[PDB]
Amino acid sequence: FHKAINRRGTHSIKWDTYKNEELIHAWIADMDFEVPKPIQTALKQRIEHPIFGYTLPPENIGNIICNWTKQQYDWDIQKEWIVFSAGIVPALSTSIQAFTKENESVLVQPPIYPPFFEMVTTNNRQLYVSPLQKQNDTYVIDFQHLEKQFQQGIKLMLLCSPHNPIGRVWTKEELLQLGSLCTKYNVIVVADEIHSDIIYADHTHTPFASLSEELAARTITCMAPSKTFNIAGLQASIIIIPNEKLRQAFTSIQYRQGFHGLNIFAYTAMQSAYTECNDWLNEIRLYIEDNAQFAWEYIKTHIPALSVTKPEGSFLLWIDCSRLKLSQNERTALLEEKGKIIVEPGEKYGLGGEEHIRINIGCPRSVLEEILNRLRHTFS
Amino acid sequence: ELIHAWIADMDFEVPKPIQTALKQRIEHPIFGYTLPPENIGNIICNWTKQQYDWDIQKEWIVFSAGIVPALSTSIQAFTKENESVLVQPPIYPPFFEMVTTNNRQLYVSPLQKQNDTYVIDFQHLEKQFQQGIKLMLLCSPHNPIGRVWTKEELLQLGSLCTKYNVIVVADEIHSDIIYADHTHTPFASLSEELAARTITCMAPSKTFNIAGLQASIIIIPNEKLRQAFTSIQYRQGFHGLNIFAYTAMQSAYTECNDWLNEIRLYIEDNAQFAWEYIKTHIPALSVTKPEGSFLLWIDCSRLKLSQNERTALLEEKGKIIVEPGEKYGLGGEEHIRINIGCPRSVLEEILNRLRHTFS
Ligand SMILES: Cc1ncc(COP(=O)(O)O)c(C=O)c1O
Ligand SMILES: Cc1ncc(COP(=O)(O)O)c(C=O)c1O
C-alpha cells in the first residue's frame, strides 16, 4: 500500500473526470490501492475461458458468504437469506418500494451519504431526519429526538453502519437502544453495512440483524466487497434478509425491474474477495487506521482552525471548517484554486454537513502527506 | 449426456479482440468507479451507420444493464398502472412478465402463421389500438420465429402507431445476426415522426456472446421520453454499466466486423441444414424459416402430444431439453425452440436426437 499507482487514463471517475493534471483527487469513495492479487488472478483465469454468456451464481457462493459473516462478525446466517444486487443504492431503492407505499415515511440520520435522501424523495416517500449530535471528536444518536420522529408513524429507517461520512462504528449498546425503538414502534430497518470490513483496532462492527431474532425479523442487511477490496466498478452486492416475507417483497420488486443476477466478474471477484484475501484485509485495516491517526495529528498541530471527527472505520475523514467562517463557494474555490485538491463538500450530506469537508484517506501515506500539506496551504 | 438446446446464447467463443481488451484492462489492477469510455458515443453512432445506415445523435444514447430492465423501465416511464401494453405472440416470455408484474393491462395481437413464416395481422392490431393501447413492445428481429420485418411491414405498423398515438419499445437485441437475403431496419430510422415515439433497445450481448457482461444501449431521440426513462433508472439507483461491459462493448463495436460477417454465414448455413434435415427426415414437424438470430421455431402439433408427454419424450428418448413453446402464448402451443448458434457437429447431433425422439 506504500507505493503510488497512476490511475489517470483508466476511466476512473475519481482521477479522469477533471483534466487539470496538478489537482490531487480525494472526493469519491474508492481507494488508490491495487486490488488483492488473488482477485486479479481469479479474473485472469475466467478470461481464459472465452465464453461470457448468462451465468448463475457459483455453486459454493452461499457457503462462502455464510463462512464470511461467521468469520468476520461471528454472525450465523442461512444461504436462503442471501439476495444479490448490482450495488447498494439499488437495494435502498428496492427496499423503499418493497416496504413502504408512496407518501409513507422514511427516516435517515444526517449528515448522511446523499442517495439515502435522494432515493426517498425521488420515489415520492416522505423524508424524516433525526440529525446526529456532534459531541467532541465524534457523533452520537439523539435517542429522544429519534423517538419523537418514530411517534409520527415512520415505516422504514435507513441505518448507515459504519456511518458515511463521519466514520462512526456503532457500539452494541447503541444498536440495541436503536433496536428497542424499532421494536417499540414496529419500524423496518435497512442496515447499509457496506463499510463493515474496514474497522479500526479498538472497534467492532456488530450487524444490527445479528442482535436478536426480533431484529433479524425486521432488518434488510446490505453488504458488499466493493469498498473493502476496491472492486466497486464490478457491481457485486449481497443483501441478507432473514424474514422470508420481507425477502419475497424485495425479490418481487427486483423481478418487476428486470433484474436477473450479477455480471460474470462480480461473482468471480466476490468468490476470491471472501476466501483468499484475509491477509491483504488485515494489512489494509492497519494501513488505513495509521493514515487516519496521521491525518488527525497533522491537522491538530498545523491547521488548528479545523476540527477533525476521529473515524473508527472506513477510509473517509470528516472535517469541520466552521471557524474559517467561509461560504461553501469561497471554501471550494480556495481548495480548488490555491490547494489544487478536490474533496467532497459537506453541504451535500444534509443537516450537520454545513461548513464540513470529507477527504478520502484510502491512499498511500505519501499522497495523504501531499493532500494535508495542500490543505494547510489552502487555509494559511 | 443431455444436450441443452433451450439456452438463449451461442456456444461460440467470443471474438479475440474482446478477449484481448478484457485481459488488457485487468493489467491495471484497480476496479473502482468508472466513466463510460470517452469515445463511446462516437463508436455507437458509427455502429448504427455502419450496420443499419441509421444516423443517431450522441445525446440519444442511454445505458442499461440488460434489455429486460429497459422493457420494465419503459413500461414504468411511459404508461401508468392499469394502462394497456400490447405484444404479438408467440413472443419471448419476459415481454408478458414485465407487463403483468408491473400491474399494466396485457393486450395481444397474435402473429399469423403463413407458409413457413409469420405476418402481422394489421386488421386485428388496429382493432386492439382502437381500444386505447399506450405502449407496444415490438421484437425486431422477432424471437422466437426469426422474422426480420421488411421496411414495408414496419411502415404499415408505423402509420398505425402514429394514427393511435402508440409509443413503441423496439427490442432490437437480435439486430446484428441477419441472413444474406434480409436487412434489419430500425423502426426509429424510418422517419422523424417514428423516431419521436420509439425507444430502441440494442446490445452486443447476443451478437458477440457477452450477455454475462450486461452491456445494453437504449436510443431515445425524443428528449422528453429520454428524461422520463432516465428518471425511472435514477429512482431505481442505476448509475452506469460495470467496467467490463464498457471494455467489451467498445471492442465489440470497433474490432470484430470480420468475426461478425463470418458468424452470420455459419448460422445461416446451420439454419439451411436444419431446415433440409427436418423436411427430409422428420415430416411430422413443420419449421418456420428464420431470417435472422440463431433460434429455430418448430411446430410439433401433428404429433398431438401434451406439453408434458412431448417434454418427457425429448428428455428420456432424445437426451435433449428444448425451449417449450406454450409459455410464448398464442401460437406457441405444441411448438419448441432449439438454439442453432453452435458448431455444425452439435447441431447434427441435436437433429439426430429430434429424429429419434419423434420416430
Ligand atoms: C454508505 C454507502 N452506501 C452505499 C454506497 C454505494 O456503493 P456501491 O455503488 O459500490 O454499491 C456507498 C458508496 O460510497 C456508501 O458509502
Ligand atoms: C428478444 C430478446 N430480448 C431480450 C433478451 C435478453 O435480455 P437481457 O439483455 O436482459 O439478458 C433476449 C434473449 O433471449 C431476447 O431474445
Side-chain angles (χ1 to χ4, degrees), chain A residues 6 10-11 13 30 35 40 43 47 50 52-54 90 93 118 123 227 231-233 235 255-256 258 261 263-264, chain B residues 9 14 19 26 28-29 31-35 38 69 72 97 102 206 209-212 214 234-236 240 242-243:
Chain A
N6 193 0
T10 59
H11 295 290
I13 301 193
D30 69 13
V35 144
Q40 318 180 19
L43 292 173
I47 292 175
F52 304 108
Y54 298 112
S93 164
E118 280 293 295
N123 282 292
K227 298 312 214 188
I231 53 158
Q235 297 186 345
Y255 186 83
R256 86 180 190 192
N263 74 76
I264 284 164
Chain B
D9 298 307
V14 152
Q19 299 179 55
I26 305 219
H28 187 257
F31 300 109
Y33 292 111
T34 108
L35 292 159
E38 219 193 29
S72 174
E97 292 297 297
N102 286 286
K206 299 274 111 185
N209 200 7
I210 64 168
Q214 308 183 327
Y234 182 75
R235 78 183 189 197
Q236 291 179 180
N242 76 81
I243 292 164

Side-chain angles (χ1 to χ4, degrees), chain A residues 54 260, chain B residues 8 66-69 92 139 143 171 173-174 206 216:
Chain A
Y54 298 112
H260 37 42
Chain B
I67 302 288
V68 177
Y92 190 46
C139 194
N143 170 1
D171 183 335
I173 199 185
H174 296 273
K206 299 274 111 185
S216 316

Side-chain angles (χ1 to χ4, degrees), chain A residues 29 87-89 113 160 164 192 194-195 226-227 232, chain B residues 33:
Chain A
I88 293 318
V89 182
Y113 180 54
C160 201
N164 165 1
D192 183 352
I194 194 173
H195 299 279
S226 307
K227 298 312 214 188
Chain B
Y33 292 111

Side-chain angles (χ1 to χ4, degrees), chain B residues 116-132:
Chain B
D116 307 292
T117 191
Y118 284 81
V119 296
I120 291 158
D121 180 347
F122 283 103
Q123 295 95 347
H124 188 269
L125 182 64
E126 181 156 12
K127 287 178 194 208
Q128 307 313 287
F129 282 12
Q130 284 169 343
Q131 298 185 60

Side-chain angles (χ1 to χ4, degrees), chain A residues 261-292:
Chain A
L262 306 176
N263 74 76
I264 284 164
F265 295 118
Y267 298 123
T268 298
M270 192 191 299
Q271 188 170 44
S272 178
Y274 287 154
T275 51
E276 296 173 322
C277 294
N278 290 157
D279 287 356
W280 186 96
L281 181 50
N282 292 332
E283 196 173 341
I284 202 189
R285 282 167 133 113
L286 268 301
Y287 198 85
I288 291 166
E289 182 179 1
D290 291 343
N291 269 12

Side-chain angles (χ1 to χ4, degrees), chain A residues 227-334:
Chain A
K227 298 312 214 188
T228 304
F229 297 107
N230 208 20
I231 53 158
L234 303 192
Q235 297 186 345
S237 317
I238 295 137
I239 320 306
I240 299 171
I241 312 173
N243 179 329
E244 188 184 67
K245 191 160 168 288
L246 297 184
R247 190 168 68 248
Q248 286 167 341
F250 185 96
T251 62
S252 285
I253 305 293
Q254 287 185 306
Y255 186 83
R256 86 180 190 192
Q257 292 179 176
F259 179 70
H260 37 42
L262 306 176
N263 74 76
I264 284 164
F265 295 118
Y267 298 123
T268 298
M270 192 191 299
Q271 188 170 44
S272 178
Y274 287 154
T275 51
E276 296 173 322
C277 294
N278 290 157
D279 287 356
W280 186 96
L281 181 50
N282 292 332
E283 196 173 341
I284 202 189
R285 282 167 133 113
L286 268 301
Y287 198 85
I288 291 166
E289 182 179 1
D290 291 343
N291 269 12
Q293 189 56 50
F294 171 67
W296 188 85
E297 287 171 0
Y298 182 107
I299 293 167
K300 192 190 161 55
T301 296
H302 302 298
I303 330 172
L306 300 180
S307 284
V308 186
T309 292
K310 271 191 252 203
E312 302 166 352
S314 194
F315 54 86
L316 302 170
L317 191 76
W318 182 242
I319 305 168
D320 193 348
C321 310
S322 277
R323 293 195 301 279
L324 298 168
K325 302 189 70 26
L326 295 172
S327 81
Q328 176 180 356
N329 281 347
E330 186 173 350
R331 177 196 78 228
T332 302
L334 286 173

